[PDB]
């Protein structure tokens, strides 16, 4: 039917960059 | 034996410099100074700094 160096620990950590990513206008 | 004593500054040499930045130890920070004198080699014949 169907188919199928490392030192400066405090100063070097205070100088870590804060890199904020840019935006694009829509 | 030290290798080339004309091109060498060894441990314990005293570099004399003058402090440029005023130092205040509240916050961790960077300093700067400038050498006041020529610094010869350990043989005393070549100005290396």
PDB file of C-alpha atoms in Angstrom:
ATOM      1  CA  UNK A   1       0.000   0.000   0.000  1.00  0.00           C
ATOM      2  CA  UNK A   2       2.887   2.363   0.808  1.00  0.00           C
ATOM      3  CA  UNK A   3       6.430   2.231  -0.527  1.00  0.00           C
ATOM      4  CA  UNK A   4       8.820   0.877   2.086  1.00  0.00           C
ATOM      5  CA  UNK A   5      61.850  39.734  33.938  1.00  0.00           C
ATOM      6  CA  UNK A   6      58.835  39.398  36.201  1.00  0.00           C
ATOM      7  CA  UNK A   7      59.682  41.834  38.972  1.00  0.00           C
ATOM      8  CA  UNK A   8      58.006  45.025  40.074  1.00  0.00           C
ATOM      9  CA  UNK A   9      55.028  43.016  41.250  1.00  0.00           C
ATOM     10  CA  UNK A  10      53.003  45.910  42.636  1.00  0.00           C
ATOM     11  CA  UNK A  11      54.086  48.599  40.183  1.00  0.00           C
ATOM     12  CA  UNK A  12      53.942  46.310  37.156  1.00  0.00           C
ATOM     13  CA  UNK A  13      50.395  45.288  38.054  1.00  0.00           C
ATOM     14  CA  UNK A  14      49.325  48.885  38.557  1.00  0.00           C
ATOM     15  CA  UNK A  15      50.563  49.537  34.998  1.00  0.00           C
ATOM     16  CA  UNK A  16      48.407  46.895  33.319  1.00  0.00           C
ATOM     17  CA  UNK A  17      46.550  48.613  30.465  1.00  0.00           C
ATOM     18  CA  UNK A  18      42.790  48.968  30.432  1.00  0.00           C
ATOM     19  CA  UNK A  19      42.027  48.454  26.748  1.00  0.00           C
ATOM     20  CA  UNK A  20      38.412  49.377  26.052  1.00  0.00           C
ATOM     21  CA  UNK A  21      37.261  48.388  22.582  1.00  0.00           C
ATOM     22  CA  UNK A  22      35.753  50.967  20.281  1.00  0.00           C
ATOM     23  CA  UNK A  23      32.176  51.182  19.079  1.00  0.00           C
ATOM     24  CA  UNK A  24      30.525  51.674  15.701  1.00  0.00           C
ATOM     25  CA  UNK A  25      27.447  53.777  15.082  1.00  0.00           C
ATOM     26  CA  UNK A  26      24.381  52.055  13.700  1.00  0.00           C
TER      27      UNK A  26
ATOM     28  CA  UNK B   1      89.963  35.456  34.304  1.00  0.00           C
ATOM     29  CA  UNK B   2      87.901  38.341  32.979  1.00  0.00           C
ATOM     30  CA  UNK B   3      87.454  38.358  29.228  1.00  0.00           C
ATOM     31  CA  UNK B   4      88.082  41.852  27.848  1.00  0.00           C
ATOM     32  CA  UNK B   5      88.772  44.335  30.610  1.00  0.00           C
ATOM     33  CA  UNK B   6      88.527  47.327  28.269  1.00  0.00           C
ATOM     34  CA  UNK B   7      84.909  46.576  27.356  1.00  0.00           C
ATOM     35  CA  UNK B   8      83.668  45.657  30.809  1.00  0.00           C
ATOM     36  CA  UNK B   9      82.245  47.143  34.013  1.00  0.00           C
ATOM     37  CA  UNK B  10      82.361  44.670  36.889  1.00  0.00           C
ATOM     38  CA  UNK B  11      80.318  44.148  40.034  1.00  0.00           C
ATOM     39  CA  UNK B  12      80.782  46.699  42.764  1.00  0.00           C
ATOM     40  CA  UNK B  13      81.589  49.599  40.486  1.00  0.00           C
ATOM     41  CA  UNK B  14      79.968  52.691  41.978  1.00  0.00           C
ATOM     42  CA  UNK B  15      78.062  54.715  39.400  1.00  0.00           C
ATOM     43  CA  UNK B  16      77.472  58.255  40.632  1.00  0.00           C
ATOM     44  CA  UNK B  17      74.325  59.972  39.399  1.00  0.00           C
ATOM     45  CA  UNK B  18      72.081  62.879  40.403  1.00  0.00           C
ATOM     46  CA  UNK B  19      68.436  62.323  41.260  1.00  0.00           C
ATOM     47  CA  UNK B  20      66.131  64.060  38.802  1.00  0.00           C
ATOM     48  CA  UNK B  21      62.685  63.215  40.131  1.00  0.00           C
ATOM     49  CA  UNK B  22      61.548  64.197  43.596  1.00  0.00           C
ATOM     50  CA  UNK B  23      60.788  60.973  45.437  1.00  0.00           C
ATOM     51  CA  UNK B  24      57.707  60.401  47.620  1.00  0.00           C
ATOM     52  CA  UNK B  25      57.009  56.815  48.659  1.00  0.00           C
ATOM     53  CA  UNK B  26      53.228  56.975  49.006  1.00  0.00           C
ATOM     54  CA  UNK B  27      52.576  55.168  45.712  1.00  0.00           C
ATOM     55  CA  UNK B  28      54.808  52.751  43.794  1.00  0.00           C
ATOM     56  CA  UNK B  29      56.598  54.632  41.117  1.00  0.00           C
ATOM     57  CA  UNK B  30      59.508  55.212  38.809  1.00  0.00           C
ATOM     58  CA  UNK B  31      62.627  57.269  39.399  1.00  0.00           C
ATOM     59  CA  UNK B  32      65.242  58.818  37.158  1.00  0.00           C
ATOM     60  CA  UNK B  33      68.793  60.032  37.589  1.00  0.00           C
ATOM     61  CA  UNK B  34      71.621  61.109  35.311  1.00  0.00           C
ATOM     62  CA  UNK B  35      75.256  60.086  35.577  1.00  0.00           C
ATOM     63  CA  UNK B  36      77.382  62.990  36.776  1.00  0.00           C
ATOM     64  CA  UNK B  37      80.727  61.533  35.683  1.00  0.00           C
ATOM     65  CA  UNK B  38      82.233  59.368  32.987  1.00  0.00           C
ATOM     66  CA  UNK B  39      82.431  55.699  33.945  1.00  0.00           C
ATOM     67  CA  UNK B  40      85.613  54.023  32.753  1.00  0.00           C
ATOM     68  CA  UNK B  41      86.157  50.319  32.205  1.00  0.00           C
ATOM     69  CA  UNK B  42      87.657  48.022  34.822  1.00  0.00           C
ATOM     70  CA  UNK B  43      91.020  48.506  33.142  1.00  0.00           C
ATOM     71  CA  UNK B  44      90.428  52.240  33.479  1.00  0.00           C
ATOM     72  CA  UNK B  45      91.097  53.032  29.823  1.00  0.00           C
ATOM     73  CA  UNK B  46      87.735  53.326  28.007  1.00  0.00           C
ATOM     74  CA  UNK B  47      84.695  55.429  28.920  1.00  0.00           C
ATOM     75  CA  UNK B  48      81.876  52.892  28.811  1.00  0.00           C
ATOM     76  CA  UNK B  49      79.012  54.967  30.214  1.00  0.00           C
TER      77      UNK B  49
END
